[model samples]
Target: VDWRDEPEPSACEQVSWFPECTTEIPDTQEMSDWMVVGKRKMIIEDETEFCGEELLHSVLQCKSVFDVLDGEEMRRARTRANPYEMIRGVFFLNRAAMKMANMDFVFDRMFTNPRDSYGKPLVKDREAELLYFADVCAGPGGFSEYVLWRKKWHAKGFGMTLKGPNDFKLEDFYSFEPYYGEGGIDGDGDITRPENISAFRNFVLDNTDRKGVHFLMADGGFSVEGQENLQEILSKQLLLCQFLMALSIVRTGGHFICKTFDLFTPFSVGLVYLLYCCFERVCLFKPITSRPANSERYVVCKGLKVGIDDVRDYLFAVNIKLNQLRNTDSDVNLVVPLEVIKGDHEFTDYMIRSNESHCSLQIKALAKIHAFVQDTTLSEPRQAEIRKECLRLWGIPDQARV
Candidate 1:
């Protein structure tokens, strides 16, 4: 039960948070009937808990070691401690492709059909219909690159990312148009801008004949170097925009997968709860390709319901509130009361269990990093095997780097 003996989330492995919704594939449902009738009450609660402190405290032993280490020393410890670090920063821009490959449901739905699991398209009229998708905040185009590599001309991609050192770089193979809200690729690609969000929604909807895309992939994050513990708090607006954009652009019955950090705080939990209520099935999954030492994970939501306009509106409103408090010392602390969210027996139990498991896993990683710092010879021998197995499962050839 302790972190010392706890197994690493193995390569090509994908673990889900929701206990009741554990299926090998994505859940195809008739959509939930929790549509709004009048006004669904949303009472924002006061914020509590310091950033990353709760989870950081759990790794007491590692904290002692890290407390004395310099920034560069800490960085090296973090990198050397992870066996999966080798899988990162490779071809396809980054390891985002492998993460998608490991999530069997999402990969199958995007590259192959979910219904037959026999390499068919999930959307009807496969011959006539194109598998359209949108990538936001994830630059260098690793996720989109994987999709294009697999489906070739069958898939189309639209992207929105910050115009900087990490913009989309899909060369000869693909032509994913990267738009930054003002149409035709202008602006900073800041998702927090209310106008940008609205404009992007209008642009995507118009292009899809008002039907939206088949799926949306968002991997939004920024440097939280010294304040890694406060990442969830700092990126709250980015997270909200990711959800709002997905809800706005994903077609009915389509799927969504977004990168998320820690979910210990009320704001994080409330946002997850909102998604739970809207999507037919929602799972917070930690794919194997994600660095084991980091608090990174993905929220995999399957089968977007037909009537989630209420939830979408609620999120958009929250984003506007969040944007208003940008310059002020104040912040939008909570989106939903813990009382209401925890009162729901199903979601409540899952939240506690997911938090515990993820917390322990992180503690395990921190402890390992500490140990690696103390002893340089300690190495993981199985990374090679894991990498090979992952490539085969993910449909990436060992010779793919041409």
Candidate 2:
């Protein structure tokens, strides 16, 4: 169904649980513009790709993507010894695209300041010649790796992980060695503490002539088991706190990107509203490479509008109070402002549509992958042949395949 054609619902009608938010919802040109931009950005382009409701239904009938990856059923298949083999195949396919796109150079365009219709930089007399960024929970440093390698920017990366296999080591940044002003791993990169925040703030400001980092990204997440609801994962992830901390350290006009799951909850919408207030443009993006069945999505904020002391302190106070309340046994209800809730409702609707478009793209890609696997047996010779065919079907250039 075309959401734009549907009749506009009342605030309460849109968010049934939040009936108290009956105040007039403010219209945002940014949101309207984004609706158009999002459609253009997420279009799969390939006509043969599966998408929309058709793809959603197809995925629902199949085993869950995670279950397919982790279960024993795929292991019993004669075509493949283990599901990871195919999972790895999928990962490489996506990675090959990233390499082909030369994502190291792509970040330069993605994070740079906005330009005009004639391609002129919007912000003039920018003091910092080299851009600076921070990547929190930067396991294996994919975001930071792209930024530093793509541009001759001065970067500082703080990776916070449990030191698992997913964690990044110091040497990964070695190739782009001198490009970083000063970068290191924070073994205890937890943003839940006051000291960690202080350390991060100091790191961004210490040697740089700027007040804060140009961009900050957080990809932190907690694993969700099959039986668990999204709330279980969201609560444990502490994404709101992470976003607040990121905001505190991002310079005025700087950009922020963070990973988030499905945007169906009150808290998620409320957070997006809060972000809308602080950013000139707030967008929900689900890159084509991101798995479709999963709720994975990124909230991209451009042009930090409020870096003033009063707003900064207010956000910090809210963060502290919320954290305190979160740790307590008290049953006190958290009150989100009416304005923020309205923005949340708007952004949530936008995300729902965006996710639908993304699912269509993923379904088409997965269908091709499934077909290739089904047709080819996993013998040594056939394995190589299937891999090549899958890459070609996906339109991945032979030179790009690793």
Candidate 3:
């Protein structure tokens, strides 16, 4: 059903006990888990292949284009960082066709503009006055760039954009080496050495108006410690405090965007729940363009007043749902029940309750991983040790290390 055609529901009527009542839809699990039929046809069927250098290169190229068009002087100021003026020239050469088609407007409608059932602003002057924003699985800052531009055009004062680093593995550092030379000067000069979290933070700070944007460095799993390199930069700039937080509501006025993952990794799902607790009006969005037709990402939006307890409850519900999905052998098809997709209303309502103290529903998850580590059903101790070492490299703590 076209959501736009539906009659508007009151705030009271809008709440639902089942995913079916809302647009909280899931994908059809019956389809091939690994099927590819479109552009750059998926040749390799392995998950590893999906996260390779080729994919990274393609994504980086798109990001580079985005930076140049957005008027990033640091990137352009450097002679080597400018990948062949030919590349930039060709893109601009087609600017007329691109502009005539109004690509920017199309993207804004498809990705940025958040609408209510009645096609009204979700919050009063929300697009103009929002203060805190975040991108959970934010890749090389693509969506963040769009939001930055949006805020700038509206002439809004400086806003904060918080995001986790794009996968913190050593290899990613090596792959993105070309984009990090001194002030974008030496494009081919080891992007890896200068491409760490510190480099990105420095580049963003030096290149953008200090009041314009801010960066945060956080990881999933148990280690919430700030990176040393990032901390060093923060020390040098007082303004950087606008972005760092031991924990934050991430509020400005009334809007925030947080992206999260649901894999068994320790962070995404639980962290999402934690965040949901803090915002007043939560919006869960799964874009049609990003995921496979049926698959969707969950985006929980909340008003500035949302509380910590609410976030914890949201985390519990997510944990329970993920467990159910795994236990029911539901991985075959990506589709989940509409009822489940809507999330458990009782739990959601419980979270909304103002008095209940928040609890760590994820404790059981921690215990489960711990037990599995010691299980005799697994490989020999030596092999298990090797496996443990591998996971550590991915940033999983040795304790929750999986």
TM-score, every prediction: 0.84, 0.60, 0.29
Please give, for residues 1-402, the per-residue lDDT of candidate 2 as tens digits.
Answer: 221232221111011111122233233422232211011111112212112455445544332443455344333342342121322223222242233123222233545443433445543324555556677765666566545543445444444444567656556442221112124643355565555666666666664464677777777776555643333223432676567766777777777878776454334555666566677666766543344334566777766765334434444555565555554443112224434444556554564566566555444434434443455553323444544544444333454222
Cα lDDT for residue 327, candidate 3? 32
Q: Per-residue lDDT of 1-402 in model 3, one digit per residue for the tens?
A: 121232221111122211222222112232122111112211222222113344323322322332323333322232221111111111111211111112223223322344433455432344564322333223333333434344444322211222234421222211111123344433322211213223444444443443212222121111213231122111211111111221232332234433222211112222333333333344433221121111122333433332343232322333333334343423211112223322656434433331111111122222222333345242212334433432233222333111
Candidate 2's TM-score reads 0.60
Candidate 2, poorest ten consecutive residues by summed lDDT:
35-44
How does model 3 fare in lDDT?
0.27
Best model per lDDT? 1
Overlapping backbone residue pairs in candidate 2 total: 2
Range of the 10 consecutive residues with the lowest summed lDDT in candidate 3: 354-363
Between candidates 1 and 3, name the one with more favorable lDDT: 1
What's the distance in Å from true for residue 168, model 3?
A: 15
Clashes of 1: 0
User: After best superposition, candidate 1 residue 263: deviation in angstroms?
Assistant: 0.5
Write candidate 1's Cα lDDT for 102-168 as tens digits: 6643345443343322434465544666778888997878888777766656667788998888887
